[PDB]
Write an enzyme that holds these catalytic residues in place. Structure first.
Site, PDB file in Angstrom:
ATOM      1  N   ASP A   1       0.800  -1.206   0.000  1.00  0.00           N
ATOM      2  CA  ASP A   1       0.000   0.000   0.000  1.00  0.00           C
ATOM      3  C   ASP A   1       0.832   1.255   0.000  1.00  0.00           C
ATOM      4  O   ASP A   1       0.279   2.339  -0.008  1.00  0.00           O
ATOM      5  CB  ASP A   1      -0.965   0.028   1.180  1.00  0.00           C
ATOM      6  CG  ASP A   1      -1.962  -1.081   1.123  1.00  0.00           C
ATOM      7  OD1 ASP A   1      -2.356  -1.450   0.005  1.00  0.00           O
ATOM      8  OD2 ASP A   1      -2.335  -1.608   2.187  1.00  0.00           O
ATOM      9  N   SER A   2       2.150   1.164  -0.047  1.00  0.00           N
ATOM     10  CA  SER A   2       2.925   2.353  -0.353  1.00  0.00           C
ATOM     11  C   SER A   2       2.887   2.576  -1.852  1.00  0.00           C
ATOM     12  O   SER A   2       2.227   1.846  -2.587  1.00  0.00           O
ATOM     13  CB  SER A   2       4.356   2.236   0.154  1.00  0.00           C
ATOM     14  OG  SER A   2       5.018   1.179  -0.472  1.00  0.00           O
TER      15      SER A   2
END
Ligand SMILES: [Mg+2]
Ligand SMILES: [Zn+2]
Ligand SMILES: [Zn+2]
Ligand SMILES: [Zn+2]
Ligand SMILES: [Zn+2]
Lengths: 45, 169, 66, 57, 1161, 51, 51
Positions: free
Chosen positions: E786-787
């Site tokens: 999710d970065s």
RNA sequence: UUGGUGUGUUU
């Protein structure tokens, strides 16, 4: 000494730390200082 | 037990005063001191004390005695507890209840769970994180400013003088 | 607000092509066809002018500040 | 929530101010990257340094 | 006519959202307040009476000097700022906001003071009611957008909210329980009481709680042998039997109580459960002895004899029980027949001929907006005014002075009350601070525009938080189009907080009396001719909580009345609602019903419109002309008979199809479209309603989302509760406004996945984000969970670069009549405690000139007070924050409310979106900027396009948000064909049309292009999916949550380091951290943490009595345990200062902790 | 509006306001005769990826 | 001197995006190694504008 | 370099 810009009539008037602070033309009591004598800088990124 | 708990000691003739670190005055707006509620309550106790000693030194209509004594007992009751069942609370000058000694000890944010068993401390730091697989397993990235703020006392020994002098420099 | 200069994705300078774009819109063109005429062929310089919505007119609606 | 939820590490210094991790340690702390906060206590003595470096690593 | 298409419904929505705008619910009910409510709250209790009649040590001077004041008309105007100069002028909301004012008007009132001579003082400003923005009784309802730029009001503003002490506050529609409805709840088991029939009373005028009659069925399930019931009343102390309070209300015999209650002499089961109630109530046989009996428990006073005891019981049964029905007598049939319906009902439910009632069936609740809230708080401080005048009257009649009344109104009362009670919202008189519904009114939020658009609509729920129960937190299925199935915050609020939908309207409050006339206008029969054995089948009819009569045929009547709302003889927002099941038929007119509109399907087989929509295309052409062919807005639609309103109670009795292609039964097996159900149960339906549009079920922060109908619904809720934290454009006048938070996002693009609904939140004309390039491909592990990746050159081109504004404040205080304050540049000599910053940037007049670069930790506003009676001035400067940098904009200087000076400063800087700054999808796939790559190092497709944002493959397959892919694809197509594709949900827009168009404009069908390494150009083995998408910017950054701390500020009270970011506090190394330290066991680290980086503190102990009484002088180096004369047995310790605090607290409570330093046994 | 700028000489590495150029296409082996790339494909590789 | 409807670093940003002619640029040196303390006419192109 | 209440948001 400071140009206190009027909020209504744009009048540059300085006040001697003694004047009640209004517009001399319509009683509008809002002033603001104007920009300095210095030169601002930016690096434009 | 006689030298520790002798049951004529469970009746207070003499109720102590703590030193004012436990109720220190707070700068309301930097000239006036709003007092802590212990100071307000010990003042209320001493006022009811003098209004006790006023009755036995003059004409006393016998339940004026009773009410001022029961008021003394009330003030000593709310000194240690403002949560007693059945009776209305002792109230402040805002409409709020009074901070007792019991309210300074129970609850999540009392002195123990909020200050002794767990508390706030220093040499911490805190941020938001980011992944970085170009790393080992026992490594954590440190932003530079957080490295500037926090520190660690390394002892000046005979095997680390040079670098530490450089870290001064 | 007001048109940016380059594209955001590629970097072809587009800011000049705002006034021409409105003038092409005045004749009844369609917006894709107008971008077609201006030589905008990657969609990078198509979203940098197609999406853009104009506020600085509203800022000049303030009858004079000074 | 379990006895790994504090673990010792080593220091790597990076600009661009966020905390960097390995991503294999994502499972024990249960951290994702939608904005978690993770703290960083620091020893102030030699004794606690060796305590961490031999047990909580 | 033809097919009403989709865009015909968007004609309908343009007419609605050009009539009302958005915030009808504030404005129109606040208009109801200012037009009628204060006139009737004054004329509620218009007169006071004093009398000082006789034996004034008199000459038997028996004189009714009755002092009689009668309150009259209110006077209403513009707000007015009376200066300290004394001059009055037209205040304006700009001049309000700049000057910490209170946009408040004169509320005047004349007073008719009269005197009884039966022997045997002008327009006072009585208070300042603050005026809402954009109201009728604000001066900006009218007057010319041109001049509004001459008056600094943005046209895409909408108002709705109030102004107090300067700042902006709002009214949450607080949500109270419904009144005067005949409920049944069942009670929990560890109790002898199982079934309950409850009510909450409130007067028809006024809408104020008085009574709460409760019923408790004695009897658990086969426990409590006599299965009879008692009542509980208001102003009693104890439960009173049912038949006794019946005989108390004036019906004594058993036969008439069973005639009032029972409707079936064959219902022998319920009749069987009846018999013990009478057999228990035998011992009280007629009226006045039951009156005497209730006199014994319920506050009829002791020794107050039978006639006045029974008087008082007749008062709790005249007033103070069933008050909302009536407060006059004579209608014991109305009262008892109401209660006979109650006994009827509770015995229906105790035999389970029904479900229990449920808490959240949303027709069974109401809402309170600004109207009813100002009604309540105005009522309160108006009573307080009553007794204030009364107090002054009994002082200036003793000395008998002709009082002028103008020194008899210290009108800081109601102005001070309303000003505090919207300042913090602790709703009530301040001397009712607790036991009060806290947090009524809120800081309005101006972070971005849509955030405000939701937040002006928000409702809140007072269950408190006591009760973790998941029944009031359910999305209970009355919610169709009334609240938002997406939006609710994460966490503690969830399940409570209900955002009024994009088809919400708030029903005002209406004269019920003509509705009564409509009832008796057709032969409704009265309540006194009622015999249920004579008429078992008549229909019993409710008006807001009073059963008023019976009738046989509701069908002709609901035809007539429903068509009179389809015409306009009624208020067209009164819900006339039929049931057929109960032989009952209700009309609510109540305040705070949440209604909604539907397309009136011609539900009637009378003509060919049956099944079809009544809305013609001629009406559509009329809306596109703007007029009817000899004004025609949404109001004429409402009064045309094309759209009828329903609230949650008529939601019970309807039949809906979703889209107007489903009204005609339609014509396959195509694997693109969606599958509506057949509805082949009723061969011949009578649809009465069809939805205008389904994406009108959403909330305001929910219609923004591109295709909400292709996701996992927690991500819908997340996107709605993140859409409020966008950076963008909040109102267009950020030049003149001075607010403590403001942020402009630079380059705001309307999204290519626009909706059709974003026209009506103006978001395509004020957006709060951009279109950047999505490329969902794991690249170098930087998007693992999710970065994301962001191309730095695109930021250098200006991507999401952020303006940052902030307004400060200071003012002059007055410490004496000749002793005031002065903002000046303080010296290094005459002034005390200079701040450890410098002072150089200050000017001659104490306020720094603009244009000057400013850092943190240096002054802007140096407020110097000379100490009241060298070194006699106090340096009390107001500095810029310890985190910020900047260059200063617009330094306001003016005069306060007080007459002294006043300042406000608007500093600004600009924040680069850098590593760690949170971003967000439009489907929740959120995260931080993981890493920044320059331009060449991106992957790049065949033409040269690089991307800017790279969400993770592994972010997708479990989160199941396939709408995100659909948005990226539709985005790329609408970019290349160059227009904004309709992504409003629930259309026939499949994926197939988008696929074919992308292919037939010269591309791959399913999105992919063959992208490359930037470090080799060796082709990426799998083809990479790749396009634009609309992005936004959430309000957090990393520069606001980084913090570290060596030492510093400790509290005086406990000497443990302080709490909060703003004072550079420390972190809470909490309980469960100590738990895991114990689990590792290295307790020496724990002795570091709770001794050494905290309140390390050193005390002493006398070794004999074990205490810390030992007085410590050190430079003289002497000690004395003064209770012991101990001078040698002395040790010191190392304990936490809070542990010492424990010890001093305990010894001040007389417990004796004694610390002996050796083991004893 | 009275402004005074300086102009100095930077490259794209400092910042991309010194971008010399705009957008760079790039391809080799358009018929995949090395099988360096591998098509994803529903039905058949030749039909759907346009030339 | 600025008094606009636009803020300042805003306009400096947009000016930084502006395309100049630099055909002759390799006989102009880099800023950070040109032999002046702050700007002179060896390594600058000073634009002064006041519309 | 205040307290003390209260509100909304982050995991
Ligand atoms: Mg998370
Ligand atoms: Zn003026
Ligand atoms: Zn482009
Ligand atoms: Zn001793
Ligand atoms: Zn030079």
């Amino acid at each position: 000494g400071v140009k206190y810009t009027c909020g209504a009539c744009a009048h540059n008037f300085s006040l001697n730390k003694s004047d009640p602070v209004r517009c001399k033309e319509c009683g509008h009591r809002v002033i603001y200082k104007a920009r300095t004598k210095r030169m601002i800088q930016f690096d434009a990124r | 037990n006689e030298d520790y708990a002798r049951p004529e000691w469970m009746i207070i003739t003499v109720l102590p005063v703590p030193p004012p670190q436990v109720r220190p005055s707070i700068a309301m707006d930097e000239t006036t001191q709003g007092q802590d509620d212990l100071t307000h309550k010990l003042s209320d106790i001493l006022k009811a004390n003098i209004n006790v000693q006023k009755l036995e030194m003059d004409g006393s209509p016998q339940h004026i005695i009773n009410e001022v004594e029961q008021l003394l007992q009330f003030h000593v009751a709310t000194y240690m507890d403002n949560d007693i069942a059945g009776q209305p609370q002792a109230l402040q000058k805002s409409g709020r209840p009074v901070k007792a000694i019991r309210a300074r000890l129970k609850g999540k944010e009392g002195r123990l769970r909020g200050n002794l068993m767990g508390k706030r401390v220093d040499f911490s730091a805190r941020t938001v994180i980011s992944g970085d697989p170009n790393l080992e397993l026992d490594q954590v990235g440190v932003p530079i400013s957080i490295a500037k703020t926090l520190s660690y006392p390394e002892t000046v020994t005979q095997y680390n003088i040079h670098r530490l002098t450089e870290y001064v420099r | 607000m007001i048109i940016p200069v380059r594209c955001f994705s590629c970097g072809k300078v587009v800011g000049d092509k705002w006034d021409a774009y409105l003038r092409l819109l005045e004749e009844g063109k369609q917006e894709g066809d107008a971008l077609d005429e201006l030589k905008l062929k990657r969609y990078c310089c198509r979203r940098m002018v197609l999406t853009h919505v104009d506020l600085i007119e509203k800022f000049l609606r303030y009858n004079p500040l000074e | 929530l379990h006895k790994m939820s504090m673990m010792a590490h080593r220091v790597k210094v990076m600009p661009y101010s966020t905390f960097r991790l390995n991503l294999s340690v994502t499972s024990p702390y249960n951290a994702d990257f939608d904005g978690d906060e993770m703290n960083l206590h620091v020893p102030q003595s030699e004794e606690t340094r060796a305590e961490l470096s031999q047990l909580c690593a | 006519d033809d097919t009403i298409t989709t865009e015909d419904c968007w004609t309908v929505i343009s007419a609605f959202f050009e009539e009302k705008g958005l915030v009808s619910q504030q404005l129109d009910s606040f208009d109801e307040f200012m037009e009628t409510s204060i006139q009737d709250l004054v004329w509620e209790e218009p007169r006071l009476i004093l009398d000082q009649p006789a034996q004034h040590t008199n000459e038997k001077d028996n004189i009714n000097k009755r002092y009689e004041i009668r309150f009259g008309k209110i006077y209403l105007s513009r707000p007015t700022m009376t200066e300290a100069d004394g001059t009055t002028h037209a205040m304006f909301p700009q001049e309000a906001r700049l000057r910490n004012l209170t946009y408040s008007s004169p509320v005047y009132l004349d007073m008719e003071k009269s005197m009884f001579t039966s022997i045997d003082g002008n327009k006072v400003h009585i208070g300042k009611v603050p005026i809402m923005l954009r109201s009728k009784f604000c001066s900006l309802r009218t007057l010319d957008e041109v001049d509004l730029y001459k008056m600094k009001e943005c046209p895409y503003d909408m108002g709705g909210y109030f102004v107090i002490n300067g700042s902006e506050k709002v009214l949450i529609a607080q949500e109270r329980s419904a009144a005067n409805i005949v409920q049944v709840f069942k009670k929990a088991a560890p109790s002898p009481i199982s079934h309950v029939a409850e009510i909450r009373s409130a007067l028809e005028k006024g809408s104020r709680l008085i009574s709460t009659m409760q019923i408790k069925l004695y009897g658990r399930e086969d426990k409590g042998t006599g299965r009879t019931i008692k009542a509980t009343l208001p102003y009693v102390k104890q439960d009173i039997p049912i038949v006794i309070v019946f005989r108390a209300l004036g019906v004594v015999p058993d036969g008439e109580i069973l005639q009032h209650i029972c409707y079936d002499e064959n219902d022998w089961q319920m009749l069987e459960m009846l018999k013990p109630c009478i057999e228990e109530g035998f011992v009280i046989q007629d009226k006045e002895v039951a009156l005497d009996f209730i006199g014994r428990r319920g506050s009829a006073a002791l020794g107050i004899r039978r006639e006045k005891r029974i008087q008082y019981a007749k008062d709790i049964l005249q007033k103070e029980l069933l008050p909302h029905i009536t407060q006059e007598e004579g209608f014991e049939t109305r009262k008892t027949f109401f209660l006979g319906y109650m006994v009827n009902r509770l015995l229906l439910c105790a035999l389970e001929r029904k479900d229990q009632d449920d808490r959240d069936h949303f027709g069974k609740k109401r809402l309170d907006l600004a109207g009813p809230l100002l009604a309540n708080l105005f009522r309160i401080l108006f009573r307080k005014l009553t007794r204030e005048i009364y107090r002054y009257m009994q002082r200036c009649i003793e000395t008998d002075r002709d009082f002028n009344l103008n020194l008899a109104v210290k009108s800081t009362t109601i102005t001070s009350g309303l000003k505090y009670s919207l300042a913090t919202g602790n709703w009530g008189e301040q001397k009712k601070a607790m036991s009060s519904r806290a947090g009524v009114s809120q800081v309005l939020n101006r972070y971005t525009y849509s955030s405000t658009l939701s937040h002006l609509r928000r409702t809140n729920t007072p269950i408190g938080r006591d009760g973790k129960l998941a029944k009031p937190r359910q999305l209970h299925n009355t919610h169709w189009g009334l609240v938002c199935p997406a939006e609710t915050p994460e966490g503690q609020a969830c399940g409570l907080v209900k955002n009024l939908s994009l088809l919400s309207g708030i029903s005002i409050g209406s004269p019920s009396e003509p509705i009564i006339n409509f009832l008796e206008e057709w032969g409704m029969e009265p309540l006194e001719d009622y015999d249920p054995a004579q008429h078992t089948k008549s229909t019993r009819i409710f008006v807001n909580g009073v059963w008023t009569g019976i009738h046989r045929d509701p069908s002709m009547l609901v035809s007539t009345m429903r068509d009179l709302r389809r015409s306009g003889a009624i208020s067209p927002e009164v819900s006339i609602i039929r049931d057929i099941r109960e032989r009952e038929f209700k009309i609510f007119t109540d305040v705070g019903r949440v209604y909604r509109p539907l397309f009136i399907v011609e539900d009637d087989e009378s003509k060919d419109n049956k099944g079809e929509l009544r809305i013609t295309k001629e009406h559509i052409r009329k809306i596109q002309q703007g007029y009817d062919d000899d004004v025609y807005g949404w109001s004429s639609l409402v009064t045309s008979g094309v759209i009828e309103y329903v609230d949650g109670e008529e939601e019970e009795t309807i039949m809906i199809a979703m889209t107007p292609e489903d009204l005609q039964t339609r014509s396959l097996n195509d694997t693109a479209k969606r599958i509506k159900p057949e509805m082949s149960t009723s061969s011949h339906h009578t649809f009465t309603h069809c939805e205008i549009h389904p994406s009108m079920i959403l909330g305001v922060a929910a219609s923004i989302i591109p295709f909400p109908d292709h996701n996992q619904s927690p991500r819908n809720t997340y996107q709605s509760a993140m859409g409020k934290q966008a950076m963008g454009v909040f109102l267009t006048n950020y030049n003149v406004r001075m607010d403590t938070m403001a942020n402009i996002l630079y380059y705001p693009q309307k999204p290519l996945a626009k909706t059709q609904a974003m026209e009506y939140l103006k978001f395509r004309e004020l957006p709060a984000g951009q279109n950047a390039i999505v490329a969902i491909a794991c690249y170098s592990g930087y998007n693992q969970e999710d970065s994301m990746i962001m191309n730095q050159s695109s930021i250098d081109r200006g991507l999401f670069r952020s303006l940052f504004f902030r307004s400060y404040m200071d003012q002059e205080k007055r410490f004496g009549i000749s002793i005031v304050e002065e903002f000046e540049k303080p010296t290094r000599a005459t002034t005390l405690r200079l701040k450890h910053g410098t002072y150089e940037k200050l000017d001659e007049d104490g306020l720094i000139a603009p244009g000057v670069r400013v850092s943190g930790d240096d002054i802007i506003i140096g407020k110097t007070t000379p100490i009241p009676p060298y070194h006699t001035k106090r340096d009390a400067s107001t500095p810029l924050r310890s985190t910020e940098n900047g260059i200063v904009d617009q330094v306001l200087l003016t005069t306060n409310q007080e007459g002294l000076k006043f300042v406000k400063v608007r500093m600004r800087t600009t924040k680069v979106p850098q590593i760690g700054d949170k971003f967000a999808s439009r489907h929740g796939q959120k995260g931080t900027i993981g890493v920044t790559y320059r331009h060449e190092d991106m992957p790049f497709s065949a033409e040269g396009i690089v991307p800017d944002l790279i969400i993770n493959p592994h972010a997708i397959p479990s989160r199941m948000t396939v709408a995100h892919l659909i948005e990226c694809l539709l985005s790329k197509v609408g970019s290349i064909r160059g227009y904004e594709g309709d992504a409003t949900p629930f259309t026939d827009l499949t994926v197939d049309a988008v696929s074919n168009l992308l292919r037939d404009n010269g591309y791959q069908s399913r999105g992919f292009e063959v992208m490359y390494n930037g470090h080799t150009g060796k082709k990426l083995m799998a083809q990479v999916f790749f396009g634009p998408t609309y992005y936004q910017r959430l309000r957090h950054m990393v520069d606001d949550k980084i913090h570290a701390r060596a030492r510093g500020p400790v509290q005086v009270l406990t000497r443990q380091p302080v709490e909060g970011r703003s004072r550079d506090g420390g972190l809470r190394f909490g309980e469960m951290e100590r738990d895991c330290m114990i689990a590792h066991g290295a307790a020496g680290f724990l002795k570091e943490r709770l001794m050494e980086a905290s309140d390390a503190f050193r005390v002493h102990v006398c070794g004999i009595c074990g205490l810390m009484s030992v007085i410590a002088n050190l430079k003289k180096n002497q000690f004395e345990c003064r209770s012991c004369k101990n001078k040698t047995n002395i040790y010191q310790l190392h304990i936490p200062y809070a542990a010492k605090l424990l010890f001093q607290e305990l010894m001040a409570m007389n417990i004796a902790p004694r610390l002996y330093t050796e083991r004893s046994g | 509006l009275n402004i005074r700028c300086i102009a100095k000489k930077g490259i794209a590495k400092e910042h991309a306001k010194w971008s010399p150029c705009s957008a760079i296409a790039f391809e080799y082996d358009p018929h995949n005769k090395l099988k360096h790339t591998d098509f994803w494909f529903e039905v058949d590789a030749k039909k759907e990826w346009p030339d | 001197m600025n008094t606009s409807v636009l803020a300042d670093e805003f306009i400096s940003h947009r000016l930084g995006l502006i395309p100049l002619v630099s055909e002759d640029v390799e006989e102009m040196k880099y800023s950070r190694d040109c032999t002046c303390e702050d700007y002179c006419d060896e390594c600058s192109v000073v634009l002064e504008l006041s519309a």
